């Protein structure tokens, strides 16, 4: 509360570390469904069904331009990528599988880097 603060967590490396994690996600062989925005002209249903589209290139631009106020807003956009994927794709599809693999991969790096 006022004039009563928890001890200061060092957050000065967060930007760089989120960038590294993102690089690793970008270079994973199963990243291909997620590298770019889904083409809303060419994929029936996507526009209406997925209220908040998200992809790695868009997270990368947001990161590079100071649009994440903190590391939690970054993790939210990453998880949004996988949550969207699960909404639109059967678990037993290449894309559905890619999304479960990438989420698992992300969550481990997240915990190992920050928790």
Swiss-Prot record:
Task: Report, as the record phrases it, the tissue specificity of this protein.
Answer: Expressed at varying levels in several tissues, whereas a smaller transcript was expressed specifically in testis.
Protein location: Nucleus
Domain (Bromo) spans 9-113
State the similarity comment.
Belongs to the WAL family.
Q: How does it assemble?
A: Component of the BRF-1 ISWI chromatin remodeling complex, at least composed of SMARCA1 and BAZ2B, which regulates the spacing of histone octamers on the DNA template to facilitate access to DNA. Within the BRF-1 ISWI chromatin remodeling complex interacts with SMARCA1; the interaction is direct. Component of the BRF-5 ISWI chromatin remodeling complex, at least composed of SMARCA5/SNF2H and BAZ2B, which regulates the spacing of histone octamers on the DNA template to facilitate access to DNA.
Q: What does this protein do?
A: Regulatory subunit of the ATP-dependent BRF-1 and BRF-5 ISWI chromatin remodeling complexes, which form ordered nucleosome arrays on chromatin and facilitate access to DNA during DNA-templated processes such as DNA replication, transcription, and repair. Both complexes regulate the spacing of nucleosomes along the chromatin and have the ability to slide mononucleosomes to the center of a DNA template. The BRF-1 ISWI chromatin remodeling complex has a lower ATP hydrolysis rate than the BRF-5 ISWI chromatin remodeling complex.
Q: What is this protein called?
A: Bromodomain adjacent to zinc finger domain protein 2B
- Gene name on record? BAZ2B
